[PDB]
Amino acid sequence: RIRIRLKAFDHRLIDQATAEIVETAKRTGAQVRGPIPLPTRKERFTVLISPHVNKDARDQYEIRTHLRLVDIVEPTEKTVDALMRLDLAAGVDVQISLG
Amino acid sequence: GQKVHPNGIRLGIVKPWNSTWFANTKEFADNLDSDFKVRQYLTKELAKASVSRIVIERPAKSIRVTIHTARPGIVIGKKGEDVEKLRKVVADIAGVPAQINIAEVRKPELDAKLVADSITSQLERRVMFRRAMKRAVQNAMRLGAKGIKVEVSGRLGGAEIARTEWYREGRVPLHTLRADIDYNTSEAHTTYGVIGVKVWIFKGEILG
Amino acid sequence: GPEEITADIPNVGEAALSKLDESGIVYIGAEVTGGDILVGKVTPKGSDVKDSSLRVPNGVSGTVIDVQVFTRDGVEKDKRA
Amino acid sequence: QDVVLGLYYMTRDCVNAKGEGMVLTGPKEAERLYRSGLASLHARVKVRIT
Amino acid sequence: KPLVGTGMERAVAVDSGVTAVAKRGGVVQYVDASRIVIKVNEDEMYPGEAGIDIYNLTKYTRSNQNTCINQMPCVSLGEPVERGDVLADGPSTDLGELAL
Amino acid sequence: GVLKIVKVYLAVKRRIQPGDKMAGRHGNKGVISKINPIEDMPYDENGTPV
Amino acid sequence: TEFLKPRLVDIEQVSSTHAKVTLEPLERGFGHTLGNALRRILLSSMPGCAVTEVEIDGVLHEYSTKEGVQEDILEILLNLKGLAVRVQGKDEVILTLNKSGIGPVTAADITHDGDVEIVKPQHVICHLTDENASISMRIKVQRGRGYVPASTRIHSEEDERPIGRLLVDACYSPVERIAYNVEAARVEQRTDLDKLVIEMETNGTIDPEEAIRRAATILAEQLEAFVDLR
Amino acid sequence: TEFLKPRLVDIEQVSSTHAKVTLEPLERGFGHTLGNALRRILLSSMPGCA
Amino acid sequence: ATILAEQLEAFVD
Amino acid sequence: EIKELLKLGDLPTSGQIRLYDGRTGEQFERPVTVGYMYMLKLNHLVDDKM
């Protein structure tokens, strides 16, 4: 089975990507597993915002890396190849893995 | 240092990001560095061309730049002569295949950054700062800004004691997150010192 | 004095410097129509500047296919010539 | 020019057409018989006109 | 290409110099983006001046009535042409005929 | 004499529109009046519009 | 009220493009009404994808010429305007054509994505003659209906696009020719019924039963203004 | 791909047996579709007794 | 109008 | 020879085909002439005169 790991910072974008991938899968092949949402990584950062000194002065940023696990149960001839030409939107790191 | 940055507070809601890519902890810093480089280069090059926003977007080991500029004609030059030239240098800077797109900025009086730049230029060529500020404000208003504020600071008219002066017109709500507040800044490197120019331009509120 | 080929078109705002380069003149190609600017060509002393800059006639569109220039030995900026 | 040809073809007659010599209760059903496809534009007919 | 012509289209389209009628016959090299390059058969070819004929195509330019005079090659690459044959179709011509 | 000599060559592409003039080879002049849709054209029984 | 209802009984495909379809059974006199109405709707208002913006590298305007090719750039834009594309999921896609070497450039050389299907693998575009020549165009395929031309789409376009993108006119309708015939139906107990034999000729991209279903929905939702309100 | 639905703007009732259903606006070449379809149905298919 | 709509009621979406 | 060439192609000998109307879907009476005329666009264009 083809496991697909979508990773992105924007959630909407990721969602869009996932849908597209599903569409790509579903026309060619059959029995797409589904878009399973894994836990989001909220990598936080604190920094001092003064140039020199003021330690209680701080900004707390974060990067929300979202995960989408799409799986394809039956890899056909037509389906797997379809993704080669079918590149997804920018800012979405995909990671296909058969078996 | 009272105020929060108006762009920065709104990135999740009404404002988008400039650099728009994903990368793991391994390659992220490098990517950032590259972005910094390319942007710097672009600024250096297209100073005379009125450039507002460089938007970098890299999918699949290939960098896509998008230059928002008021006059594409001077950035493009002859059809695909200057752009092409820019591209290879961009690629070199990055170390990947480059692709430059050029967005045409409708209404450069409403783009905040551009306005700021203009003001800075004016300051440099020894105009009355106040008159410049007025012009900036007025023009924006004429163009259909719901509001505009501009602020200039330090060594105004080469005076020994530095001060800040600012002109607002219309409404410029900063606490309201859903307000499209185009904020940007610039610096006039005059004979007496630097003169920092801030400008806020309120396009309107977004409803979603 | 002589007239001048510069983009630094007056009174008219960020609606002059557009289909041209930083040193003046239409930048080639483009979807130009009526009321555009092709060759910034205006003199000072003619707060006493004017707009003789040859523009596009009323009602026509088009694409700049070719620009010829055997101008007064000097047309150049610091270097395109 | 066009309109006199349209009239001269309209108000004319031929010795046999669809609906030769049928009788019609008004000009409204004359146009209704022309449009439905049961008579011809020139087919001689007793009508009742007012 | 007028479907109902008189056959005098050929003579008018050749004799008015809007098409690039071949000077010396032969084959073709067809760089053509810039110029048709015709290799000359040996019988029509001079002993010195080895020689291959390079025809200049006049692309999009102004006529006297603001119309567009433009020549397009109507021969492919590696194709025999004879002396007096046409190579590039001018304005209002279709394979050497006259298409107003 | 002449100093600044800049010639710019535009190229308009004009299509066809209500008001142009077309003509055959026989003297049949015409000002193209209505630019109809494809559907309203008189089609023969094969299906092709005129 | 002794009326009936028709169904699509037999749908024969004479080829991939030219394909007839029956309709059975129609009432007396309804044949020319439904045939002419479905003709007008099926010729005016069908959705089909077409080429809108073409982006060739190392180009200034569409009236230039290029290194290593036969057709000039206006010829390339015309041959691209004739293209027949069939997308499934999205409504706006970007293809890619890259090819070098001596020989013609078919439509089968476009590096397809997954959800785009180019249904004419012998559509010629270019004739590359130099082996050192290359061509890399990036097409943009929207989806609409009717005819929207370059002049009106010169200011209509809102998304501020950069300069260098050649604008091709949009021929969106994938139906080119349609004829209907009202035969005599072969009904085992009725003689006053008829069949409608619609003979479509498509662009290859549209499915005829889907086209007839969409035209029927267009006609029904247009007539709902007569049905509901007065 | 969205179509223009109209509003029925007028029933100018001239007499009890007269009407004029002014109706606007439709897509280009749809007024003839609706009008001809309704006209043929009202002529040769509407049920009733006499 | 409802005669034609019920006539076309078969093959719609 | 025009008639004989129209018999080589499968076209009617008179040069005239029956044509339907795109608006009403119904046949024009008295068959009309369809053919191919070589029509020219003269350089008297309307957006040089307006």
We report the CATH number of the domain holding residue G229 as: 3.30.1360.10
Q: Return residues 1-40 of H near I (CB < 8 Å).
A: 37-38
Q: Report the 3 state secondary structure along B50-115.
A: CEEEEEEECCCCCEEEEEEECCHHHHHCCCCCHHHHHHHHHHHHHCCCEEEEEEECCCCCCCHHHH
Are G37 and G95 contained in the same domain?
Answer: no
Number of domain units in chain B:
2
CB-CB under 8 Å, I1 with H38: yes
User: Which of G49, G176, G167, G168 is closest to G119 using CA atoms?
Assistant: G49
d(CA E76, CA E88): 11
CB-CB under 8 Å, E4 with J43: no
Which chain H residues are within 8 Å of G206, Cβ to Cβ? none
CB-CB under 8 Å, J39 with F22: yes
Whether A93 contacts chain B with CB within 8 A? yes
Interface test with C, best of F3, F7, F8 (most C CBs within 10 A): F8
Which chain J residues are within 8 Å of F43, Cβ to Cβ? 19-20, 22
CB-CB under 8 Å, H32 with F37: no
Are B80 and B26 contained in the same domain?
Answer: yes
CB-CB under 8 Å, G111 with A86: no
**Domain assignment of residue B2, yes or no:** no
Are G64 and G84 contained in the same domain?
Answer: yes
The owner of tokens 């610096």 is B187
Q: How many CA atoms lie within 13 A of D11 on its CB side?
A: 3
CA-based nearest distance F43→chain J, Å: 6
* Amino acid present at D35: R
d(CA G164, CA G61): 7
Are B174 and B142 contained in the same domain?
Answer: yes
d(CA H34, CA G227): 12
**Domain assignment of residue B147, yes or no:** yes
User: Which of B46, B186, B170, B183 is closest to B129 using CA atoms?
Assistant: B186
Q: Return residues 1-50 of J near G (CB < 8 Å).
A: 22, 24-26
CB-CB under 8 Å, J46 with F17: yes
- Residue C34's CB: how many other CB atoms inside 10 A? 12
Are G158 and G127 contained in the same domain?
Answer: yes
In which domain, by residue range, is G227 found?
Answer: 1-47+173-230
Are B89 and B142 contained in the same domain?
Answer: no
Beta strands in chain G (DSSP E): 18-21, 48-56, 85-87, 93-94, 97-100, 103-106, 116-118, 124-128, 134-144, 147-148, 166-167, 170-171, 175-182, 196-202
Interface of A with G (CB under 8 A): 20, 23-24, 27-28, 82-83, 85-87
Burial class of C81 by CB neighbour count within 10 A (0 to 12, 13 to 18, 19+): exposed
Are G77 and G42 contained in the same domain?
Answer: no
Domain termination site, one of B106, B122, B147: B106
**Domain assignment of residue B9, yes or no:** no
In which domain, by residue range, is B167 found?
Answer: 107-206
User: Which of B122, B139, B7, B114 is closest to B53 using CA atoms?
Assistant: B114
d(CA D24, CA D34): 12
Written as six digits, the tokens of G134 are 């290359």
CA-based nearest distance B132→chain C, Å: 14
d(CA G140, CA G168): 10
Which chain H residues are within 8 Å of I3, Cβ to Cβ? 41, 45-46
**Domain assignment of residue B1, yes or no:** no
Whether J contacts F, i.e. 3 or more CB pairs less than 8 A apart, is yes
CA-based nearest distance G63→chain E, Å: 7
* Amino acid present at E67: T
Are G156 and G70 contained in the same domain?
Answer: yes
What 3-state class would DSSP assign to B185?
strand
CA-based nearest distance J38→chain E, Å: 6
CA-based nearest distance G14→chain F, Å: 16
d(CA G158, CA G148): 15
d(CA G142, CA E39): 46
CB-CB under 8 Å, J43 with E67: yes
How, if at all, do strands A32-37 and A58-72 pair?
antiparallel
CA-based nearest distance H43→chain I, Å: 13
Are B76 and B163 contained in the same domain?
Answer: no
Alpha-carbon separation of residue A73 from A37, A88, G88, G185 (angstroms): 17, 21, 22, 49
Burial class of C39 by CB neighbour count within 10 A (0 to 12, 13 to 18, 19+): buried
Q: Which residues pair with E79 in a beta bridge?
A: none
Domain termination site, one of B43, B77, B106: B106
d(CA I5, CA E16): 65
d(CA B80, CA G163): 9
CB-CB under 8 Å, H44 with D36: yes
Q: H31 to chain F: nearest residue by CA?
A: F40
* Cis peptide, bond prior to residue E2, ω within 30 of zero: no
Are B95 and B112 contained in the same domain?
Answer: no
Number of domain units in chain G:
2
Written as six digits, the tokens of E19 are 């098409």
Residue-wise burial string across G89-121, b where 16 or more C-beta atoms lie within 10 A, e elsewhere: beeebebebebeeeeebbbebbebbbbbebbbe
Task: Read off the CATH number of the domain in which G164 is found.
Answer: 2.170.120.12
Are G157 and G221 contained in the same domain?
Answer: no
Alpha-carbon separation of residue B104 from B81, C72, G154, G179 (angstroms): 18, 33, 14, 47
Domain termination site, one of G172, G194, G215: G172
Instruction: Write the CB contacts of G224 (distance below 8 Å, at least 6 apart in sequence).
Output: H5, I5
CB-CB under 8 Å, G161 with B104: yes
Tell how far CA J15 is from the center of its chain.
10
Chains F and J: how many Cβ contacts under 8 Å?
Answer: 55
Q: G64 to chain F: nearest residue by CA?
A: F11
User: Which of C15, C18, C35 is closest to C27 using CA atoms?
Assistant: C18
CA-based nearest distance F21→chain H, Å: 25
Are B91 and B171 contained in the same domain?
Answer: no
Interface test with E, best of J38, J39, J48 (most E CBs within 10 A): J38
CB-CB under 8 Å, A7 with B20: no
Are B22 and B98 contained in the same domain?
Answer: yes
**Domain assignment of residue B11, yes or no:** no
Helix, strand, coil shares of chain A as percentages rounded to 5? 25, 40, 30
Contact B51, B66 (CB under 8 A): no
Are B137 and B162 contained in the same domain?
Answer: yes
Chains A and B: how many Cβ contacts under 8 Å?
Answer: 24
CB-CB under 8 Å, G62 with C30: no
Interface test with F, best of J23, J27, J45, J48 (most F CBs within 10 A): J45
**Domain assignment of residue B90, yes or no:** yes
Are G190 and G133 contained in the same domain?
Answer: no
- Residue G84's CB: how many other CB atoms inside 10 A? 21
Instruction: Identify which of F2, F3, F10 has the shortest CB distance to residue C60.
Output: F10
Instruction: Write the CB contacts of B111 (distance below 8 Å, at least 6 apart in sequence).
Output: B52, B70, B105, B182, B201
Which chain F residues are within 8 Å of C72, Cβ to Cβ? 2-5
Alpha-carbon separation of residue B155 from B124, B137, B150 (angstroms): 12, 21, 17
Which chain E residues are within 8 Å of G65, Cβ to Cβ? 33-34, 59
Are G41 and G142 contained in the same domain?
Answer: no
Written as six digits, the tokens of E85 are 């044959």
Instruction: Identify which of B20, B22, B64 has the shortest CB distance to residue A7.
Output: B22
Are G190 and G154 contained in the same domain?
Answer: no
User: Which of G162, B78, G74, G55 is closest to F13 using CA atoms?
Assistant: G74
Which chain H residues are within 8 Å of G45, Cβ to Cβ? 3, 27
Q: At what angle do helices H31-44 and G208-227 cross, to 10 degrees?
A: 70
CB-CB under 8 Å, G216 with I4: no
CB-CB under 8 Å, E76 with G63: no
First to last CA, chain C: 23
Contact B15, B7 (CB under 8 A): yes
Whether G contacts A, i.e. 3 or more CB pairs less than 8 A apart, is yes
What 3-state class would DSSP assign to A45?
strand
Contact B68, B105 (CB under 8 A): yes
Are B100 and B123 contained in the same domain?
Answer: no
Q: Report the 3 state secondary structure along chain C.
A: CCCCCCCCCCCCCCCCCCCECCCCCECCEEEECCCCEEECCCCCCCCCCCCCCEECCCCCCEEECEEEECCCCCCCCCCCC
Interface test with J, best of E1, E4, E98 (most J CBs within 10 A): E4
Interface test with H, best of F34, F38, F39 (most H CBs within 10 A): F39
Are G72 and G40 contained in the same domain?
Answer: no
Phi-psi region of E40 (alpha: psi -120 to 50; beta: other; left: phi over 0): beta
**Domain assignment of residue B20, yes or no:** yes
Neighbours of chain B (3+ CB pairs under 8 A): A, C, G
**Domain assignment of residue B6, yes or no:** no
Tell how far CA C17 is from the center of its chain.
8
Contact G136, G97 (CB under 8 A): yes
Instruction: Write the CB contacts of A73 (distance below 8 Å, at least 6 apart in sequence).
Output: A1, A31, A32, A33
Written as six digits, the tokens of J2 are 């025009």
Which chain G residues are within 8 Å of I2, Cβ to Cβ? 227
Domain termination site, one of B71, B91, B106: B106
The owner of tokens 């000077």 is E23
CA-based nearest distance C62→chain G, Å: 10
Are G73 and G163 contained in the same domain?
Answer: yes
Are G209 and G97 contained in the same domain?
Answer: no
CB-CB under 8 Å, H37 with G27: no
* Amino acid present at G180: Y
Are B124 and B47 contained in the same domain?
Answer: no
Are B102 and B165 contained in the same domain?
Answer: no
- Residue C37's CB: how many other CB atoms inside 10 A? 24
User: Which of B107, B164, B112, B141 is closest to B6 using CA atoms?
Assistant: B112
First to last CA, chain J: 47
Written as six digits, the tokens of G187 are 């009904």
Are B112 and B166 contained in the same domain?
Answer: yes
User: Which of F3, F6, G62 is closest to C38 using CA atoms?
Assistant: F6
